[PDB]
Amino acid sequence: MREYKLVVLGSGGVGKSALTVQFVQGIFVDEYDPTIEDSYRKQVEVDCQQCMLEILDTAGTEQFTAMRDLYMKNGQGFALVYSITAQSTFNDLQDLREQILRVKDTEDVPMILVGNKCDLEDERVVGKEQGQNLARQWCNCAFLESSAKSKINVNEIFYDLVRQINR
């Protein structure tokens, strides 16, 4: 069956691990344990079809920065995650988009922009339309707001990357 190498990218504390663990294991990770390296695998039914997903959950460190193009070169699909409760993590993503297109020698790279923590509406400091604007700017990039805690749009992140890959 087809394997899908996915890569989860974004600043510290935005929910990259919580999203990935919710997806693969169906549990919510409550406490913040900064990631050094972690990979996960999951076989999934996409549309109606067998897909092996390997998900690389990345650190926000100098070491990841020094390896990043390697993760990009090898990855087939990218979730770029920020938190709606933390402005700097949204401003940090632009760089990541342009680099992926640089490394892949194309603008048609499977990608999704993910505003996570949508259950924390009272703490929101980045607008929904504000994320939709950034995605639009990125050549009509896929966009979701998600919650690893409420399980809103979690599977959809990975299924949309697999559907993107398939096209």
């Binding site: 663990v21 693969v24 294991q25 549990i27 990770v29 344990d33 050094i36 390296e37 972690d38 990979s39 996960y40 695998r41 390997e54």
Partner: protein, 76 residues
């Protein structure tokens, strides 16, 4: 002060070690988030001198003693 650990179903993690933790202490969160029970698993150090031969370790091994070692966890 980290240890890299290869895991079942072609997964891997790297864990930080604080002096005093056992191997099981340094790994327990990474095993829980992947549903891995250490009582159903063996853990091995990879012997890079001996073509990677696996040497089995006690889950209670001192983790500081293993810094820089690369380990593998397999099901029993």
């Amino acid at each position: 002060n980290t240890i890299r650990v290869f895991l079942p179903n072609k997964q891997r993690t790297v864990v930080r070690v604080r002096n005093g933790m056992s191997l099981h202490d340094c790994l327990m969160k990474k095993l829980k988030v992947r549903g891995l029970q250490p009582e159903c698993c063996a853990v091995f150090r990879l012997l890079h001198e001996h073509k990677g031969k696996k040497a089995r370790l006690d889950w209670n091994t001192d983790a500081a003693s293993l810094i820089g070692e690369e380990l593998q966890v397999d099901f029993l």
